[PDB]
């Protein structure tokens, strides 16, 4: 019946994996909430855990914090009785173990130790927020001393600490107040660094925490407009090399735009130093994304026309020897920071900004690299580098057409994007400029996780447009050939191609004849129920009574 | 890409693609049966010989196909009919998608084979094990067997004018589900809709049945119950064979003195178009309409206009993946590739080395085996090890993810 929790406690001071995991697993059971073991047996377990955490060989500590986490999560009485004492012990060990950091990270287990301690503190103070009476008198006299330690530790371990301070700053905006300057310093020291040794997650977290720093109606607006105003100097610095006023409607808009960062220097004899310009614009875009896409405890003014104008002027930036070669690569990356901002302005706000959904699609044509000589032809060698960016473009288009829907008039950007997507759907080879008797082994074959993205884009195109003939026949040939190839290689057809053939059957558009019976010939032993309804239709849905 | 025709006469084994004008005559083949050939596991072709009591096995995977017999398979009895139950739903790895390639060794689960006097032999193919033998199912013969869904149900037809629907789990571990006596003379063929679902409760699956009674009977299959017919037609000529369009838009019937067509979405003289086959799930009336066919030389009299395509004494029919070409086998041992609309032959395939076209097949394509056990039955033993031969097949095996790995890596160094 009952597993005698004293037995778990006494077998816990020594327990390796295949015993310790059973101890943690059986302690989930709710029958340890019951009369007259609530003052004499849980006390024994908690004193055992406390003796494990208070002094140990750094294995009993890891074991102990995991044990307290599981116990407090699956038993609210242990929380309401002893959570303050457990959290005090864990914070004390964290404090002594972060008083030194370069003698505690010396053995490849200090990192995991900080991970488990920080995670355990976070989990405890994420369960003591559903109890007002308990968030008093166990956390609030302790956060004043918890938070400076976490700040000092975030200088070295931002990937692990910053979500905790983010949640604490968000749920408590009045105890983080007198430490706020001390936080800001470290965040400017983490942005003044190279800022590419940090991951995307860490970059986003420092941006988000700097954004939530300004919670202390109006300060959010000041920080937001400061970051928005730090865009125009960089663009005018880029305008001394692209020679604007060749097109004046752009230069009218550039001067129509409205601080801790260094004013940067550029040298043309060292063209690699031109990689500072994208690596500042991406930074400011991340900070802007943080100020915009985050939740708040109050509403906020967000300028949408301003950032739309900013995105519009970013994608206008396009068309001694190696310098020209380096200029031919930074500019797509510059445009992509307009793409990356419209993708967040679209999904998070949705139909707000419906007015801008037609200009974005026209401006995406500027992102496409054309051949240099005079022509409207696509430069496929540049497109081979830009794969992730064009995937982001495809997701942006699919985000827009969820709201716009089917479109009467057609535009030219979609046909060029289809040509791009059909180029990217071909198995790349990188020996074409020239063997060793086998040039077919030097290919980069396209996974199915990429074909899914391409096929979702073609679904969006065939749904909402009556396309021209040749950009339709290419799609049909692609779908049929690849489906047959995969049905030979495999014994089946993946689901994205089936969805593509479904859309090709349902939405033929300008065609005078469907591809229905060929889809069924391919779907011979892979049956599906869409075409049953099409060929063998059903009685309506209310005739039955 | 192109389509591939595998047809065999009583003394000839030709294989040829439709748009290639190249062909391979298999050396040793003999048949006097209507449907006796099958293509097994995209690596093999099985043909049941006549008057030898064995199956010939040809390897058809090569770039230069094996003209000769790759292998033989003796049997207990000479048997006429064949059908295969293809294994599906094993290559995706539904637990997590890895999209396994096919192995070099693949096989189906079953090999249905039926002989004269109505006996049915079914064999596991991964290991030759005769799981079950039904001594008598039809009481004169069997002429065609087909698995309509993947391995779920199989349908049989013989010369007792009864078409039987089994259930594969109730046949291999028999008491069939339903029997169909609506014909009076031997049922020579049937066909089922190429468009199908995963189940029968939410589909209306059409079964066309054809006999020497000069009738064509269209049955609605949706059970959960018995099937209900909703139309039957009638013919002046002794009908022999039948195929459908790949979407159940038409019917094409092969018979003595020509091959005839029939539109199922029948267009009247008001620009009014009537679907003869309308139905639902299990709720459906039993009032099967009657109509009669008459050639070309408006339907409330009980007559319908079939359009004559050809004048050849056809034995068998098949259809292309487009749904626009018929491949018809005459009694002079040659195939005609014809176009449905214009009624103009485009190609004529003969064999080179004679009897009629026994059977033929088509599927599109792009540019050892166990011995069968003669009278042995795997019983209710549990200590028996039901060993099979099997192979799984490898799974299919960018840069921004690599750079993100690099960015996460760089933080650990203080240098």
């Amino acid at each position: 019946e009952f597993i005698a929790v004293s037995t778990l406690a006494r077998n816990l001071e020594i327990a390796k994996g295949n015993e310790f995991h059973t101890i943690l697993a059986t302690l989930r059971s709710p029958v340890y909430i019951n009369e007259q073991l609530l003052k004499s047996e849980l006390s024994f377990l908690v004193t055992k855990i406390l003796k494990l955490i208070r002094s140990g060989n750094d294995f009993d500590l890891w074991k102990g914090c995991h044990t307290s986490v599981v116990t407090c999560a699956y038993n609210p009485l242990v929380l309401s009785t002893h959570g303050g004492q457990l959290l005090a012990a864990i914070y004390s060990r964290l404090e002594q173990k972060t008083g030194f950091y370069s003698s505690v990270i010396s053995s490849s287990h200090g990192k995991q130790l900080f991970n488990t301690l920080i995670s355990s503190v976070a989990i405890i103070i994420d369960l003591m927020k559903n109890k007002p009476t308990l968030s008093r008198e166990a956390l609030v006299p302790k956060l004043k001393a918890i938070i400076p330690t976490l700040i000092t530790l975030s200088q070295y371990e931002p990937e692990l600490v910053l979500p905790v301070l983010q949640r604490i700053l968000k749920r408590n905006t009045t105890t983080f107040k007198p430490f706020t300057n001390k936080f800001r310093t470290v965040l400017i020291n983490l942005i003044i660094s190279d800022y590419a040794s940090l991951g995307t997650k860490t970059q986003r977290l420092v941006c988000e925490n700097f954004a939530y720093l300004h919670l202390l109606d109006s300060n959010w607006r000041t920080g937001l407009m400061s970051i928005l105003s730090q865009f125009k100097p960089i663009i005018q610095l880029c305008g001394e090399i692209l020679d604007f006023e060749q097109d004046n409607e752009l230069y009218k808009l550039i001067k129509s735009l409205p601080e801790f960062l260094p004013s940067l220097k550029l040298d043309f004899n060292a063209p690699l130093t031109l990689w500072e310009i994208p690596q500042r614009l991406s930074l400011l875009a991340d900070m802007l994304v943080a100020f915009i896409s985050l939740p708040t405890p109050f509403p906020i003014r967000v300028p949408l026309g301003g950032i739309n104008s900013l995105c519009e002027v970013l994608l206008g930036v396009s068309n001694d020897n190696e310098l020209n070669g380096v200029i031919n690569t930074i500019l797509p990356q510059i445009q992509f920071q307009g793409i990356r901002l419209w993708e967040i302005m679209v999904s998070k706000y949705g139909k707000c900004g419906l007015s801008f959904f037609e200009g974005i699609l026209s401006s995406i044509e500027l992102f496409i690299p054309l051949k240099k000589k005079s022509n409207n032809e696509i430069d496929f060698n540049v497109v081979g580098s830009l794969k992730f960016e064009f995937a982001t473009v495809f997701r942006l288009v699919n985000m827009i057409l969820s709201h716009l829907g089917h479109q009467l008039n057609i535009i030219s950007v979609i046909s060029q994007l289809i040509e791009v997507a059909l180029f990217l759907s071909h198995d790349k080879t990188l020996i074409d400029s020239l063997i060793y008797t086998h040039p077919e082994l030097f290919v980069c074959k396209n996974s199915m996780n990429w074909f899914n993205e391409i096929n979702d884009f073609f679904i969006t195109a065939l749904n909402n447009w009556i396309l021209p003939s040749t950009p339709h026949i290419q799609i049909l040939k692609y779908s049929i050939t690849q489906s047959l190839r995969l049905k030979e290689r495999f014994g089946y057809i993946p689901e994205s191609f089936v969805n593509l053939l479904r859309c090709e059957v349902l939405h033929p558009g300008s065609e005078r004849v469907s591809i229905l019976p060929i889809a069924i010939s391919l779907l011979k032993n892979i049956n599906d129920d869409m075409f049953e309804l099409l060929c063998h239709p059903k009685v309506p849905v209310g005739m039955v009574y | 890409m192109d389509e591939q025709v595998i047809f065999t006469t009583n003394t000839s084994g030709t294989i040829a693609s439709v748009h290639s004008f190249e062909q391979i005559n298999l050396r040793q083949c003999s048949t006097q049966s209507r449907n006796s050939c099958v293509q097994v596991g995209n690596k093999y072709l099985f043909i049941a010989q006549a008057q030898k009591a064995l199956i010939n096995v040809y390897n058809l995977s090569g770039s230069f196909k094996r003209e000769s017999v790759e292998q033989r398979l003796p049997l207990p009895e000479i048997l006429k009919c064949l059908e295969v139950v293809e294994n599906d739903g094993v290559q995706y790895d539904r637990i997590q998608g890895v999209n396994h390639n096919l192995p070099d060794f693949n096989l189906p689960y079953l090999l249905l084979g039926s002989t004269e006097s109505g006996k049915l032999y079914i064999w596991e193919l991964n290991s030759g094990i005769l799981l079950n033998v039904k001594p008598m199912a039809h009481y004169q013969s069997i002429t065609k067997i087909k698995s309509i869904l993947n391995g779920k149900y199989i349908i049989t037809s013989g010369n007792d004018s009864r078409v039987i629907i089994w259930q594969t789990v109730d046949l291999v571990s028999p008491k069939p589900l339903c029997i169909l006596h609506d014909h009076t003379l031997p049922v020579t063929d049937f066909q089922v809709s190429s468009s199908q679902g995963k189940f029968l409760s939410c589909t209306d699956t059409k079964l066309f049945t054809v006999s020497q009674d000069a009738t064509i009977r269209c049955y609605d299959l949706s059970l959960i119950k018995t099937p209900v017919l909703l139309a039957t037609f009638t013919t002046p000529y002794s009908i022999k064979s039948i195929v459908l369009d790949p979407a159940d838009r038409a019917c094409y019937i092969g018979t003595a003195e020509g091959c005839f067509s029939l539109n199922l979405f029948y267009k009247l003289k008001g620009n009014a178009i009537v679907n003869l086959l309308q139905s639902a799930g299990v709720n459906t009336v039993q009032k099967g309409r009657v109509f009669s066919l008459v050639q070309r030389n408006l339907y409330a009299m009980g007559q319908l206009v079939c359009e004559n395509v050809l004048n050849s004494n056809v034995s068998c029919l098949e259809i292309s993946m487009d749904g626009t070409l018929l491949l018809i086998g005459d009694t002079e041992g040659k195939v005609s590739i014809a176009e449905i609309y214009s009624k103009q032959i485009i190609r004529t395939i003969q064999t080179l080395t004679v009897g009629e076209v026994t059977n033929l097949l088509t599927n599109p394509y792009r540019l050892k085996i166990p011995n069968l056990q003669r009278v042995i039955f795997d019983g209710k033993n549990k200590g028996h090890l039901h060993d099979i031969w099997y192979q799984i097949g490898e799974p299919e095996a960018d840069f921004n993810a690599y750079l993100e790995q690099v960015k996460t890596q760089e933080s650990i160094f203080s240098h």
């Binding site: 060929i518 | 038409a250 176009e339």
Partner: peptide
């Protein structure tokens, strides 16, 4: 007129070029 019916012209699906082989 209807896309999902048998058309009234002889060679449909000739403009998809599935079965053609281009000469090089």
């Amino acid at each position: 007129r209807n896309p999902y019916l048998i058309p009234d012209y002889p060679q449909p699906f000739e403009h998809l070029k599935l079965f053609t082989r281009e000469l090089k």
